[PDB]
Ligand binder design. Structure first.
Ligand SMILES: *CC(=O)NCCNC(=O)CCNC(=O)[C@H](O)C(C)(C)COP(*)(=O)O
Lengths: 485, 61, 487
């Protein structure tokens, strides 16, 4: 049974939103910079708006920043999907978050109140979302590895198909706070000294550090059509398997990937010569990249008149190693929605060990429009051997509210900026007003503007900042520093 | 005096000035442990379960 | 689609196997002792690295939880009557729930990163067995094992898996974890777990692990496996908007129980036992008792027997669900109810007479099929319930001469035990020939009587399929563990 994707949220280096991520990917820019006293690092990871979620500053000080980031991502995802969180209380909403790092606990333990137990456990990452949203559905954290996010997405889809959950939250998160994780990672010697991910390139020497998070809202296609929700995409089928008896536990196996791809394309009703793009899991390594290329050529490259376009998002932001699958799924969904294929960086000379011409595969290194429905595939291979694949097809007076005066003025300014942006110019002002009045929850503080033109409304909103359904620029938080001492 | 809301600093709101009355303990953050601690912190000056805001709590004294 | 459980393995304080666990539970003894307060294992630094082809340095850097899970899976496969060598390149899924990584804390005071990942706890099994099924580790809290069991059952029902290994493990090696547990304020000062009692003042730490083998009931019947039990349904839910993120909710538990007993088709007043999740605290125990009385207590003409294994070994917080499931399976197999310790007077907040519940504090036979329920509530607020009903010449092999003599000794001891006296020697030989794998060093004994065969086995302590019967259990394998600890 197909699963309807209706909304998503993400937080990536140099990309604080889906629009920012699309702008970064379409412009061919890399967010991998040096450590802010190589790799993609977020900005102000120690800042959190604890007042919005009703959390005391003392609890937030010992709180894992990953939990706060996931809570903010979930709030943004539910806001962007047109669903009021207050209407999700006492409902069987499922939460699926895949995390595999707890470096905050190591930082706390290397150098004792009652908040340490609650704030240093992986289950509370999803339990806090369940508590805040009042969800009666299943909530758990799956530890898979580099493919934890895709495993969580597959579990959410299976739960939706079974019927025990009506709305699911699937995604992942990863943060690199402690230098101990970096030291252990460099001990393995799998980091490229150049600090870049040379996917399907002859200069591949390893991957680069990356951090960030992503979440997505999953619902059944029938229920989404019944409720009239705007569908971002359609997940057709997914499957999870393991390499099994390979040469080494770390070394991946081609046969398992081939079988996984064949089985995931068999039940999805998708034949070759109609898949327009495939999201690569390659981390710029000279070991697994040839295996992945050979598997893709054997499964999808065989019997194809035109070369299959391939690419990866790790060339821009890096290997998040805890949220790679959800990031790839978000990139594929954005490409499907915009009907364009973003270029992939770090590709100059083809890998001699990879016969791209023989495998009927080509790396997309130029922004080109997408033409025919369009089918894309996102693959995530865990380090231990777990592999997942997801197939996604394309879908077939202004009131501003906030809990603080400064927050209200920030919301008004951001709304005015979004309206002035060309993205918001494609929607009529009546649609914007309807979305603000129906798809946005009413807070303690509110402001109402009126006018006869869009420019007048924007001017009024900026002055105070000192029916179809359309997207809105999420919520503007007032983050404050909360760190251990 | 009578109110002397100086023990609210256990909430972590810096000085005991940012704490606001006519509110609810569950919104500002109060579990069983903090409730018991605050009940035992008034020995130097029902009573808390039925008195959410600090105003009615200090109304007793 | 009901699931068939055809084998299980466990490692608990003063319980190295299902027989030892049954002996401990029936005798009404407690494994909670002093720190060498809480149940503890003999040793956790000992492992047989040569059995799995693991280098000694890798074993030293290996997480003991991974080794324990691998050993438990091997024991469960050996006792399930399935040859592991025939499980290669098959859709076998592994689901292990773990929530402790104190070995990383010990290391942080290339092999290091491989022996400190929680996911590999399952993934290594897929590497050892060569399985192509899903292998993921689920972190939920105190209900991780039950969640993993439910996920394995659902995967088997869907059809992407043939045989599943579902369970969990938890080890307490670091004193820092004990420090945080004491600072939280949940450890009982008396070092005892008073479930549903008036002396409830916290729980006791416990370490151990468990695993079970899950297969489709129809497929198991077609193959002809020894069905240990039949799991009917399993549901997972969250308490949502409770009073406190830590404080559990009664309405969510009531709804979960109602849905799990409606989906399984088991009406009230025919369930003979319920495995309690009581942690010996005066907060969640009244809520659990009220939920049980409202769901299962109502509409029953007799008091419902309830009990918890935490009164015998203590709270594990990583394998409590699988331990309760194993205890329920053992009770169903033996058709007897073990007593519950640390129970003298009912809790004033718990109206047992009004709730139509009673604590099983005596050893009595079980009479009507028999249906049991196992509950597991997580710390974050995740609840799971599982309903399980009852089923409707000698060759020895090992990889070392010392291992061979140890296996012969354990086999002879099991034969001398009254449990082994119910199986004919021909059945024992058939099980040894077919249900056991032939290792590098093998020996064959000959005799005309059981006593002569046992005496020959103690003295020394080919297509055999066509030589011969039913399938009977055997005392698994005799490991040769060696110390492997970081320096
Ligand atoms: C494995 C696991 O979850 N173990 C703990 C289970 N605990 C309970 O069932 C009781 C929950 N107890 C509490 O919430 C305590 O009362 C607190 C933590 C002291 C908070 O008390 P407050 O709500 O009165």
């Amino acid at each position: 049974e197909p699963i309807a994707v209706i909304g998503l949220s993400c937080r990536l280096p140099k990309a604080s939103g889906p629009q920012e991520l699309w702008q970064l990917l379409d412009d061919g820019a890399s967010a991998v910079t040096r450590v802010p006293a190589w790799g993609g690092f977020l900005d102000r990871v120690d800042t959190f708006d604890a007042g919005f979620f009703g959390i005391s500053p003392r609890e937030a000080a010992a709180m894992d920043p990953q939990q706060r980031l996931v809570l903010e991502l979930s709030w943004e995802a539910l806001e962007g999907a047109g669903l009021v969180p207050a209407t999700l209380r006492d409902t069987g909403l499922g939460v699926f978050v895949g995390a595999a790092r707890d470096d905050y606990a190591t930082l706390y333990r290397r150098r004792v109140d009652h908040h340490a137990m609650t704030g240093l456990h992986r289950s509370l990452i999803a339990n806090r979302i369940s508590y805040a949203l009042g969800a009666h559905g299943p909530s758990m954290v799956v530890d898979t590895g580099c493919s934890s996010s895709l495993v969580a997405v597959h579990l959410a889809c299976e739960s939706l198909r079974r019927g025990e959950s009506d709305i699911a939250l699937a995604g992942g998160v990863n943060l690199n706070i402690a230098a101990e994780s970096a030291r252990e990672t460099a001990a393995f010697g799998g980091l490229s000294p150049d600090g870049q991910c040379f996917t399907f390139d002859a200069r591949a020497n390893g991957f680069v550090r990356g951090e960030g998070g992503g979440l997505v809202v999953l619902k059944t296609l029938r229920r989404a059509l019944a409720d009239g929700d705007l569908v971002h995409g359609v997940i057709l089928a997914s499957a999870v398997n393991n390499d099994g008896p390979s040469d080494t536990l770390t070394t991946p196996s081609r046969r398992a990937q081939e079988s996984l791809l064949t089985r995931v394309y068999r039940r999805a009703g998708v034949t070759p010569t109609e898949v327009g793009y495939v999201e690569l899991h390659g981390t710029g390594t000279k070991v697994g990249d040839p295996i992945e290329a050979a598997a893709l050529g054997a499964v999808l490259g065989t019997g194809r008149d035109t070369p299959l376009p391939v690419g990866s998002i790790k060339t821009n932001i890096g290997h998040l190693e805890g949220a790679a699958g959800i990031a790839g799924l978000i990139k594929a969904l954005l490409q499907l929605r915009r009907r364009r294929l973003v270029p992939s960086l770090n590709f100059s000379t083809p890998n001699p060990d990879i016969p791209l011409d023989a495998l009927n595969l080509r790396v997309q290194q130029e922004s080109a429009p997408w033409a025919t429905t369009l089918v894309a595939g996102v693959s995530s291979f865990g380090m231990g051997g777990t592999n997942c694949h997801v197939v996604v097809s394309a879908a077939p007076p202004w009131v501003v509210s906030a809990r603080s005066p400064q927050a209200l003025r920030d919301q008004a300014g951001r709304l005015a900026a979004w309206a002035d942006s060309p993205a918001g110019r494609e929607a009529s002002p009546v649609d914007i007003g309807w979305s603000l009045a129906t798809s946005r929850t009413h807070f303690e503080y509110r402001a109402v503007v009126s006018g006869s033109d869009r420019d007048e409304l924007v001017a009024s909103l900026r002055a105070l900042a000192s029916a179809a359904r359309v997207e809105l620029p999420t919520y503007a938080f007032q983050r404050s520093r909360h760190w251990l001492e | 005096e009578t109110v002397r809301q100086l023990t609210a600093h256990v909430l972590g709101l810096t000085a005991a000035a940012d704490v606001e009355m006519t509110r609810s303990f569950k919104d500002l953050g109060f579990d069983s442990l903090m409730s018991v601690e605050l009940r035992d912190r008034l020995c130097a000056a029902t009573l808390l379960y039925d008195h959410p805001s600090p105003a009615e709590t200090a109304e007793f004294v």
